[PDB]
DNA sequence: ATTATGACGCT
DNA sequence: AGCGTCATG
């Protein structure tokens, strides 16, 4: 009806860098460009663990969370780049700095929400209004959308990928009412024009290619971004949602790839997101809780209200290291030495953060895992963070965790520690 | 031994 | 405050 709100108020984009860590290494080392390549952490155990994979390597079945030795079985010519190691641990500074490069360019076009090291949501609503009032009813040319897919098109009454892309785009642009400055489809289209410009600026000024999704909210923008990777962007209109969701596994929607999504599937006896529409809001709230139920009721209709938060910088700065198998920490000197290594990296990153961003952290969170505990964190404890001093930070973390040592001998540490994590939180403008 | 993080919800 | 969940470069 004329009041059933349709969640079409906003234009939201999700920009995701393609195989980011790989692109950072390929920019630095041209020998790795346009090759099957992957980025690995460490080397000794099974060749190191892969954390990023070029699309050429993905064609061979290489994935993240794969040991490099196994990846080399699938792709013997796979090229590898190793993450920096400093103070005995992986150091991701190069990739954080590259991320800042990209986030600063995105911020020129609109306010962004840093969702991860390599992805940000963009609220384009205002930028779209301004570009519309600049165009003054002039139609949008396909030339303004050279890497855009329109999800769901072409449809109705060439065998090449780009030919299909252009056919769908032409169907979309023909149907456009470029006279209605309040038409949601037109607003999304102008949003996509802007995202083409943003992605062009990112590639020109960093060398990095990215994909993007443009829709009316964050969940649809994220889903859209994944439909045509790499180096492409996808527009998911409100109208495309019924068909898109009719065959979309529930786990593909952000927030539903874990336990909650499995419970939606099992409790309701469904497989696809579109099947959620048959339940009342009260029914969904009865199985999944007030918040999740309302969210699911709206999401399966393409509607979600989560705002793009104005936040370009991480809320937390943390340092973590696992000590698996034999490498678990069994002496107090071991535990203190590694706490100091982590605290030294933390101090360096925190000092750079305070210089760059005019803020200081005030809470230190210390997390540990003990051997035999299946939970990723066995214990989390906070203390005050009043000085950027690695020695103080590490002594405080030790003070806060030392009561976990069940060993009657203070020299020994039982049960051995399989993970240490230091996290600076609660920033204040400084 | 699937590693180093980061965000957020729950109570 | 501490724990759990979800994401995944
Ligand atoms: Mn990415
Ligand atoms: Mn990403
Ligand atoms: Mn990924």
Coordinates of C-alpha atoms (C1' of nucleotides) and ligand atoms in Angstrom, one line a residue:
Chain A
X1 CA 0.0 0.0 0.0
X2 CA 0.9 3.7 0.0
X3 CA 2.3 3.3 3.5
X4 CA 4.1 -0.1 3.4
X5 CA 7.6 1.4 3.5
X6 CA 9.9 -0.2 0.9
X7 CA 13.4 0.6 2.3
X8 CA 14.4 2.7 -0.7
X9 CA 15.3 5.9 1.0
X10 CA 19.1 5.5 0.9
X11 CA 21.8 4.7 -1.7
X12 CA 24.5 2.5 0.0
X13 CA 27.6 1.1 -1.6
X14 CA 30.0 -1.6 -0.4
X15 CA 33.5 -1.3 -1.9
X16 CA 35.7 -4.3 -1.4
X17 CA 39.3 -4.5 -2.6
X18 CA 40.0 -7.6 -4.7
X19 CA 42.5 -10.1 -3.2
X20 CA 43.8 -7.1 -1.2
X21 CA 47.0 -8.4 0.5
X22 CA 47.8 -10.0 -2.9
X23 CA 47.3 -6.7 -4.7
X24 CA 49.5 -4.9 -2.1
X25 CA 52.3 -7.5 -2.8
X26 CA 51.7 -7.3 -6.6
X27 CA 52.0 -3.6 -6.6
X28 CA 55.3 -3.8 -4.7
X29 CA 56.7 -6.7 -6.8
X30 CA 55.7 -6.5 -10.5
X31 CA 56.9 -10.1 -11.0
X32 CA 53.8 -11.2 -9.2
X33 CA 51.3 -9.4 -11.3
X34 CA 48.8 -11.3 -13.5
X35 CA 50.0 -14.6 -12.0
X36 CA 48.6 -17.2 -9.7
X37 CA 49.8 -15.9 -6.4
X38 CA 48.9 -16.0 -2.7
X39 CA 49.9 -14.3 0.5
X40 CA 51.1 -16.6 3.4
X41 CA 51.8 -16.1 7.1
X42 CA 54.8 -18.0 8.4
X43 CA 56.5 -20.8 6.4
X44 CA 57.7 -23.7 8.6
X45 CA 54.5 -25.6 9.2
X46 CA 53.2 -26.9 5.9
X47 CA 54.6 -24.0 4.0
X48 CA 52.7 -21.3 5.8
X49 CA 49.0 -20.5 6.0
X50 CA 47.4 -18.8 3.0
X51 CA 45.3 -15.7 3.8
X52 CA 44.8 -14.1 0.4
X53 CA 44.6 -15.6 -3.1
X54 CA 44.7 -14.0 -6.6
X55 CA 41.9 -14.8 -9.0
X56 CA 44.3 -16.6 -11.3
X57 CA 45.2 -18.9 -8.3
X58 CA 41.5 -19.3 -7.3
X59 CA 41.0 -20.8 -10.7
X60 CA 43.1 -23.8 -9.5
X61 CA 41.1 -24.2 -6.3
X62 CA 43.6 -22.2 -4.1
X63 CA 41.7 -20.7 -1.1
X64 CA 42.3 -18.9 2.2
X65 CA 42.9 -21.2 5.2
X66 CA 44.8 -23.5 3.0
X67 CA 48.4 -24.6 3.8
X68 CA 50.8 -23.4 1.1
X69 CA 52.2 -26.9 0.6
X70 CA 48.7 -28.1 -0.3
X71 CA 48.0 -25.1 -2.5
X72 CA 51.2 -26.0 -4.4
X73 CA 49.7 -29.4 -5.0
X74 CA 46.8 -27.7 -6.7
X75 CA 48.9 -25.0 -8.5
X76 CA 52.5 -25.9 -8.7
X77 CA 53.4 -22.6 -10.3
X78 CA 51.7 -20.7 -7.5
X79 CA 53.8 -17.7 -6.4
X80 CA 53.9 -16.8 -2.8
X81 CA 54.5 -13.6 -0.8
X82 CA 55.1 -13.8 2.9
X83 CA 53.7 -11.4 5.5
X84 CA 56.4 -9.4 7.3
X85 CA 57.6 -10.9 10.7
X86 CA 58.6 -8.5 13.4
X87 CA 59.3 -9.3 17.1
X88 CA 58.6 -13.0 16.3
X89 CA 55.1 -12.5 14.9
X90 CA 53.2 -11.6 11.8
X91 CA 53.2 -7.9 11.2
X92 CA 50.4 -6.5 9.0
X93 CA 51.5 -2.9 8.9
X94 CA 52.0 -2.8 5.2
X95 CA 48.4 -3.8 4.6
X96 CA 47.0 -1.4 7.2
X97 CA 48.9 1.4 5.5
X98 CA 47.6 0.4 2.1
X99 CA 44.1 0.3 3.5
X100 CA 44.5 3.9 4.8
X101 CA 45.4 4.9 1.3
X102 CA 42.2 3.5 -0.1
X103 CA 40.0 4.7 2.7
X104 CA 41.2 8.3 2.3
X105 CA 40.3 8.4 -1.4
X106 CA 36.9 6.9 -0.7
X107 CA 36.3 9.6 1.9
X108 CA 36.6 12.3 -0.7
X109 CA 33.3 11.2 -2.3
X110 CA 31.2 10.5 0.8
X111 CA 31.3 9.5 4.5
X112 CA 32.5 5.9 4.8
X113 CA 32.2 3.1 7.4
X114 CA 35.4 1.1 7.7
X115 CA 34.0 -2.4 7.9
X116 CA 37.3 -4.2 7.6
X117 CA 40.9 -3.7 6.4
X118 CA 39.8 -3.9 2.8
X119 CA 36.2 -2.8 2.7
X120 CA 34.0 0.1 3.5
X121 CA 30.3 1.0 3.2
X122 CA 29.5 4.3 1.5
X123 CA 26.3 6.4 2.1
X124 CA 25.8 8.0 -1.3
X125 CA 22.3 9.4 -0.7
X126 CA 23.4 13.0 -0.5
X127 CA 26.0 12.8 -3.3
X128 CA 23.3 11.2 -5.5
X129 CA 20.9 14.1 -4.8
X130 CA 23.6 16.6 -5.8
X131 CA 24.6 14.7 -9.0
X132 CA 20.9 14.4 -9.9
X133 CA 20.3 18.1 -9.5
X134 CA 23.4 18.7 -11.6
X135 CA 22.3 16.4 -14.4
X136 CA 18.9 18.2 -14.7
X137 CA 16.8 15.4 -16.3
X138 CA 19.6 14.4 -18.7
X139 CA 19.6 10.6 -19.1
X140 CA 22.4 8.4 -18.0
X141 CA 24.7 7.0 -20.7
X142 CA 25.9 3.5 -20.7
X143 CA 29.4 5.0 -21.1
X144 CA 29.1 6.3 -17.5
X145 CA 28.7 2.7 -16.3
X146 CA 31.5 0.7 -18.0
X147 CA 32.0 -2.0 -15.3
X148 CA 28.4 -2.1 -13.9
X149 CA 26.2 -5.2 -13.8
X150 CA 22.5 -4.9 -13.3
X151 CA 21.5 -7.9 -11.3
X152 CA 18.6 -9.8 -12.9
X153 CA 19.2 -8.4 -16.3
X154 CA 19.0 -9.1 -19.2
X155 CA 15.7 -11.0 -19.0
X156 CA 12.8 -11.9 -21.2
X157 CA 12.7 -12.2 -25.1
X158 CA 25.7 -13.1 -27.8
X159 CA 27.5 -15.7 -25.7
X160 CA 30.1 -13.3 -24.2
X161 CA 30.4 -12.1 -20.6
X162 CA 30.8 -8.4 -21.6
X163 CA 28.0 -8.8 -24.2
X164 CA 25.6 -10.0 -21.5
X165 CA 26.7 -7.2 -19.2
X166 CA 26.0 -4.6 -21.8
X167 CA 22.7 -6.2 -22.8
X168 CA 21.5 -6.1 -19.1
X169 CA 22.7 -2.5 -18.7
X170 CA 20.9 -1.4 -21.8
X171 CA 17.6 -3.0 -20.7
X172 CA 18.1 -1.2 -17.3
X173 CA 18.8 2.2 -18.8
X174 CA 15.9 2.0 -21.2
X175 CA 13.4 1.4 -18.4
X176 CA 14.7 4.3 -16.4
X177 CA 12.4 7.3 -15.6
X178 CA 15.2 9.9 -15.6
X179 CA 12.5 12.6 -15.1
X180 CA 11.7 11.5 -11.5
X181 CA 14.4 12.8 -9.2
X182 CA 12.8 10.7 -6.4
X183 CA 12.8 7.4 -8.4
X184 CA 14.8 4.9 -6.3
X185 CA 16.0 3.1 -9.5
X186 CA 17.4 6.3 -10.9
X187 CA 19.0 7.1 -7.5
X188 CA 20.7 3.8 -7.5
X189 CA 21.9 4.3 -11.1
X190 CA 23.4 7.7 -10.2
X191 CA 25.0 6.0 -7.2
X192 CA 26.6 3.5 -9.5
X193 CA 27.9 6.3 -11.7
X194 CA 29.5 7.8 -8.6
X195 CA 30.9 4.4 -7.6
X196 CA 32.5 4.0 -11.0
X197 CA 34.2 7.3 -10.4
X198 CA 35.3 6.2 -6.9
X199 CA 36.7 2.9 -8.1
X200 CA 38.4 4.7 -11.0
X201 CA 40.0 7.1 -8.5
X202 CA 41.1 4.3 -6.3
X203 CA 42.8 2.4 -9.1
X204 CA 44.4 5.5 -10.6
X205 CA 45.8 6.7 -7.3
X206 CA 46.8 3.4 -5.7
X207 CA 47.0 0.8 -8.5
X208 CA 44.4 -1.3 -6.6
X209 CA 41.3 -2.7 -8.2
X210 CA 38.1 -3.3 -6.3
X211 CA 34.6 -4.6 -6.7
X212 CA 31.5 -2.9 -5.3
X213 CA 27.8 -3.4 -4.7
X214 CA 25.2 -0.6 -4.9
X215 CA 21.8 -1.0 -3.4
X216 CA 19.5 0.6 -0.8
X217 CA 21.2 -0.8 2.3
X218 CA 24.3 -2.5 3.7
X219 CA 23.2 -6.1 3.4
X220 CA 22.1 -5.8 -0.2
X221 CA 25.2 -3.8 -1.1
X222 CA 27.5 -6.4 0.4
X223 CA 25.6 -9.2 -1.4
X224 CA 25.7 -7.3 -4.6
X225 CA 29.4 -6.7 -4.3
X226 CA 30.0 -10.4 -4.3
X227 CA 28.0 -11.2 -7.5
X228 CA 30.5 -10.0 -10.1
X229 CA 34.1 -10.1 -8.9
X230 CA 36.7 -9.2 -9.7
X231 CA 37.1 -5.5 -10.9
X232 CA 33.3 -5.1 -11.4
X233 CA 30.4 -3.5 -9.6
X234 CA 26.8 -4.7 -9.3
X235 CA 23.6 -2.8 -8.8
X236 CA 20.9 -4.7 -6.9
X237 CA 17.6 -2.8 -7.2
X238 CA 14.7 -3.2 -4.8
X239 CA 12.8 -4.9 -7.7
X240 CA 15.5 -7.5 -8.2
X241 CA 15.2 -8.9 -4.6
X242 CA 12.3 -11.4 -5.0
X243 CA 14.1 -13.3 -7.8
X244 CA 17.6 -12.9 -6.3
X245 CA 16.4 -14.2 -2.9
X246 CA 14.3 -17.0 -4.3
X247 CA 17.4 -19.2 -4.8
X248 CA 19.8 -17.5 -2.4
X249 CA 21.0 -19.8 0.4
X250 CA 20.3 -18.2 3.8
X251 CA 24.0 -18.5 4.8
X252 CA 25.0 -16.0 2.0
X253 CA 23.5 -13.1 3.8
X254 CA 25.8 -11.2 6.2
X255 CA 25.1 -12.3 9.8
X256 CA 23.5 -15.6 8.7
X257 CA 26.6 -17.6 7.8
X258 CA 26.9 -19.2 11.3
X259 CA 24.8 -20.7 14.1
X260 CA 21.8 -18.3 13.7
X261 CA 21.5 -19.0 10.0
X262 CA 21.7 -22.8 10.6
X263 CA 18.9 -22.4 13.2
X264 CA 16.7 -20.5 10.7
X265 CA 17.2 -23.3 8.2
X266 CA 16.6 -26.1 10.8
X267 CA 13.7 -24.6 12.7
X268 CA 11.8 -23.2 9.8
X269 CA 12.6 -26.1 7.4
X270 CA 13.7 -23.7 4.6
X271 CA 16.8 -23.2 2.4
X272 CA 16.5 -19.8 0.7
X273 CA 16.1 -16.3 1.9
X274 CA 13.0 -15.7 -0.1
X275 CA 11.2 -18.4 1.8
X276 CA 11.3 -16.2 4.9
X277 CA 8.6 -14.0 3.5
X278 CA 5.9 -16.6 4.4
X279 CA 6.4 -16.1 8.2
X280 CA 4.9 -13.3 10.2
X281 CA 7.1 -10.9 12.0
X282 CA 5.8 -12.3 15.3
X283 CA 6.7 -15.8 14.2
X284 CA 10.3 -14.9 13.3
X285 CA 10.6 -13.0 16.6
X286 CA 9.3 -16.0 18.4
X287 CA 12.1 -18.2 17.1
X288 CA 15.0 -15.8 16.8
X289 CA 14.3 -13.0 19.3
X290 CA 12.8 -9.6 18.9
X291 CA 15.7 -7.9 17.1
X292 CA 16.7 -10.8 14.8
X293 CA 13.0 -11.6 14.0
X294 CA 12.3 -7.9 13.0
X295 CA 15.6 -7.8 11.1
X296 CA 14.8 -11.1 9.2
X297 CA 11.2 -10.0 8.5
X298 CA 12.4 -6.8 6.8
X299 CA 15.6 -8.3 5.3
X300 CA 13.9 -11.0 3.3
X301 CA 11.9 -8.2 1.7
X302 CA 15.1 -6.3 0.8
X303 CA 14.7 -3.8 3.7
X304 CA 17.3 -3.1 6.4
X305 CA 17.9 0.1 8.3
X306 CA 21.4 -0.3 9.8
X307 CA 23.1 3.0 9.1
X308 CA 26.5 3.5 7.5
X309 CA 28.4 4.8 10.5
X310 CA 30.7 7.7 10.0
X311 CA 33.8 5.8 11.1
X312 CA 36.9 5.7 8.9
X313 CA 39.2 4.4 11.7
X314 CA 39.2 1.2 13.7
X315 CA 37.7 1.4 17.2
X316 CA 40.4 -1.0 18.5
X317 CA 44.1 -1.7 18.0
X318 CA 45.1 -5.2 18.8
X319 CA 48.0 -7.7 18.6
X320 CA 47.5 -11.4 18.8
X321 CA 49.5 -14.6 18.4
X322 CA 48.6 -18.3 18.6
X323 CA 51.1 -20.8 20.1
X324 CA 49.7 -24.1 18.7
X325 CA 50.9 -27.6 19.4
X326 CA 54.4 -27.9 20.8
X327 CA 54.9 -24.1 20.7
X328 CA 52.5 -23.4 23.6
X329 CA 54.0 -21.3 26.3
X330 CA 54.9 -23.3 29.4
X331 CA 57.3 -21.1 31.4
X332 CA 56.7 -17.7 33.0
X333 CA 59.7 -16.3 31.2
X334 CA 58.2 -17.4 27.9
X335 CA 54.8 -15.8 28.7
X336 CA 56.5 -12.6 29.8
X337 CA 58.8 -12.5 26.7
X338 CA 55.8 -12.9 24.3
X339 CA 53.7 -10.4 26.2
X340 CA 56.5 -8.0 25.8
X341 CA 56.8 -8.7 22.1
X342 CA 53.1 -8.1 21.6
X343 CA 53.2 -5.0 23.8
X344 CA 56.1 -3.5 21.8
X345 CA 54.2 -3.9 18.5
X346 CA 51.1 -2.4 20.3
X347 CA 53.1 0.5 21.6
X348 CA 54.5 1.2 18.1
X349 CA 51.0 1.1 16.5
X350 CA 49.4 3.1 19.3
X351 CA 52.0 5.8 19.1
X352 CA 51.6 6.1 15.3
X353 CA 47.8 6.1 15.8
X354 CA 48.0 9.0 18.4
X355 CA 50.1 11.0 16.0
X356 CA 47.9 10.4 13.0
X357 CA 44.4 10.5 14.5
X358 CA 44.6 12.7 17.6
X359 CA 43.3 10.2 20.1
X360 CA 44.5 7.9 22.9
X361 CA 43.3 4.5 24.0
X362 CA 42.4 4.1 27.7
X363 CA 41.7 0.4 28.2
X364 CA 43.9 -2.6 27.7
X365 CA 42.2 -5.9 27.1
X366 CA 44.3 -9.0 27.7
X367 CA 42.9 -12.3 26.2
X368 CA 44.5 -15.7 26.6
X369 CA 43.7 -19.3 25.5
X370 CA 44.9 -22.2 27.6
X371 CA 45.7 -25.6 26.1
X372 CA 42.7 -27.9 25.9
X373 CA 40.1 -25.1 25.8
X374 CA 38.1 -25.2 22.6
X375 CA 36.8 -21.6 22.9
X376 CA 39.1 -19.2 21.0
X377 CA 39.4 -17.0 24.1
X378 CA 39.8 -18.8 27.4
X379 CA 39.9 -15.6 29.4
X380 CA 39.4 -11.9 28.8
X381 CA 40.4 -9.3 31.4
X382 CA 40.7 -5.5 31.2
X383 CA 43.0 -3.0 33.0
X384 CA 43.7 0.7 32.7
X385 CA 45.9 1.8 29.8
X386 CA 47.4 5.1 31.1
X387 CA 50.8 5.2 29.2
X388 CA 52.0 4.1 25.8
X389 CA 54.8 2.0 27.3
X390 CA 55.3 -1.6 26.2
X391 CA 57.0 -2.5 29.4
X392 CA 54.2 -1.2 31.6
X393 CA 51.6 -2.7 29.3
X394 CA 53.2 -6.1 29.3
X395 CA 53.7 -6.1 33.1
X396 CA 50.0 -5.1 33.6
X397 CA 48.8 -7.8 31.2
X398 CA 51.0 -10.3 33.2
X399 CA 49.5 -9.0 36.5
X400 CA 46.0 -9.4 35.1
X401 CA 46.5 -13.0 33.8
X402 CA 49.0 -14.5 36.3
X403 CA 46.2 -15.9 38.4
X404 CA 45.4 -18.4 35.6
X405 CA 48.7 -20.3 36.2
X406 CA 47.5 -23.4 38.1
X407 CA 51.1 -24.6 38.4
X408 CA 52.2 -24.5 42.0
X409 CA 55.7 -23.7 40.6
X410 CA 55.9 -20.0 39.6
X411 CA 58.7 -20.8 37.2
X412 CA 56.4 -23.1 35.2
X413 CA 53.1 -22.2 33.4
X414 CA 50.3 -24.8 33.5
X415 CA 48.1 -25.3 31.6
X416 CA 50.4 -24.0 28.7
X417 CA 49.1 -20.9 26.8
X418 CA 48.1 -21.3 23.2
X419 CA 47.2 -17.7 22.5
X420 CA 48.1 -14.2 23.8
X421 CA 46.1 -11.1 22.7
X422 CA 46.6 -7.5 23.7
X423 CA 43.9 -5.0 22.6
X424 CA 43.8 -1.2 23.1
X425 CA 40.2 0.1 23.3
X426 CA 38.1 3.0 24.5
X427 CA 39.7 5.8 22.5
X428 CA 39.3 9.5 23.5
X429 CA 40.1 12.6 21.5
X430 CA 43.5 13.8 22.7
Chain B
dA1 C1' 48.1 -26.5 13.5
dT2 C1' 42.7 -22.4 10.2
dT3 C1' 46.2 -17.2 11.9
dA4 C1' 45.7 -12.1 13.1
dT5 C1' 42.6 -9.0 13.6
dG6 C1' 38.1 -6.4 14.1
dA7 C1' 33.0 -5.4 15.0
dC8 C1' 29.1 -6.1 17.7
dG9 C1' 25.4 -8.5 20.7
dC10 C1' 24.2 -10.5 25.2
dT11 C1' 23.7 -10.4 30.1
Chain C
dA1 C1' 32.7 -6.1 32.6
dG2 C1' 33.4 -10.7 30.5
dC3 C1' 31.7 -13.9 27.1
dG4 C1' 29.9 -15.4 22.6
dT5 C1' 29.2 -14.8 17.5
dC6 C1' 30.3 -13.5 12.8
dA7 C1' 33.4 -12.0 9.5
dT8 C1' 37.9 -13.4 6.8
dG9 C1' 42.8 -10.5 4.7
Ligands
LIG1 MN1 38.4 -8.0 -0.6
LIG2 MN1 36.5 -7.6 2.3
LIG3 MN1 37.7 -12.8 0.9

